[PDB]
Design a protein around this ligand. Structure first.
Ligand SMILES: O=C(c1ccc(Cl)c([N+](=O)[O-])c1)N1CCN(c2ccccc2F)CC1
Length: 298
């Protein structure tokens, strides 16, 4: 379809050459063969959508380029999108509760990192589900999560790719644990479990960086101790920081892109809902919005 063709050639499709192997534009002979094989296998099953290089390579990387297991993971995902209504969630779901409950679990995207990734912030430590459940449900919070993911894929990543000069398939997540207790950790645990399950199985290879900040001492000490036994890919992606996280964040995010409260210089109009209701980034800049148009407002 022209439509889909126009969209694909409307932003850069190659990852930088120093990215991980098996990423778009960085494929060896074997990898290119696995991609072509997986594609025809999915075409033979009648799939017509989501068969672009970027998508299929993510499923291949998630299965170490085992073509057969990538096919099964892909087919599992399309079945979930069917049962959950994912393909129309942007039109069907309406998180009208958000101004009322945002402060009880702040979640927001704000600008980009030095690699061009959209930066996602989650103030898990402030979570108050007792107040949240007066207004909304875990089921609706997960719908809102998938809504945002669909908005990342459809509108934030293509804009971030154009603004960066190269393909951007991943986000940079900052999770603030300030205020977390054993009690509230248990209360958010079911939500976090379902969110990771959805991320790993239906959005594979979308995690580029994951910073935990204000981590309690026991949690941070454990990571510092087991850090040497981690996959070198993993140790470049996951950071568990305590109270002094600002300098580490500033190595990864330009100071003018990082919110003031986290050691940066980026400001929002605190009178108009400030950070918690904001969605600022290149996907709100006409310079970087392509034929998909501008992302909806939550
Ligand atoms: O894998 C992801 C992930 C999943 C989907 C999308 Cl579309 C993106 N993205 O590019 O914005 C990232 N994440 C890592 C785990 N994540 C997470 C998981 C559980 C609790 C909180 C969290 F922030 C969310 C982000």
């Amino acid at each position: 379809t022209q439509q889909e063709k126009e969209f694909l050639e409307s932003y850069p499709q190659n990852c930088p050459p120093d990215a991980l192997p098996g990423t778009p534009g960085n494929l060896d002979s074997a990898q290119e063969k696995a991609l072509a094989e997986l594609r025809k296998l999915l075409e033979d099953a009648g799939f017509i959508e989501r068969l672009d290089d970027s998508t299929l390579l993510r499923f291949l990387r998630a299965r170490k380029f085992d073509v057969q297991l990538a096919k099964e993971m892909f087919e599992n995902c399309e079945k979930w999108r069917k049962d959950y209504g994912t393909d129309t969630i942007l039109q069907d779901f309406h998180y009208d509760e958000k101004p009322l409950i945002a402060k009880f679990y702040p979640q927001y995207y704000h600008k980009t990192d030095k690699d061009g990734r959209p930066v996602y912030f989650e103030e898990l430590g402030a979570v108050n589900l007792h107040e949240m459940n007066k207004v909304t449900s875990e089921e609706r919070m997960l719908k809102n999560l998938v809504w945002e993911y669909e908005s990342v894929v459809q509108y934030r990543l293509p804009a971030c790719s154009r603004a960066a000069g190269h393909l951007v398939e991943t986000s940079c997540t900052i999770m603030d644990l300030k205020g977390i207790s054993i009690s509230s950790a248990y209360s958010v645990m079911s939500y976090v479990r379902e969110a990771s399950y959805i991320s790993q199985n239906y959005y594979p290879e979308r995690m580029g960086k994951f910073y935990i900040i204000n981590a309690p001492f026991g949690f941070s000490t454990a990571f510092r101790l087991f850090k040497p036994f981690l996959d070198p890919v993993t140790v470049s992606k996951i950071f568990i920081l305590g109270s002094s996280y600002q300098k580490e964040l500033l190595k990864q995010i330009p100071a003018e892109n990082l919110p003031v409260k986290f050691g940066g210089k980026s400001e929002v109009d605190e009178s108009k809902g400030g950070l918690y209701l904001s969605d600022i980034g290149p996907w709100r800049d006409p310079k970087y919005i392509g034929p998909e148009g501008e992302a909806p407002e939550a």
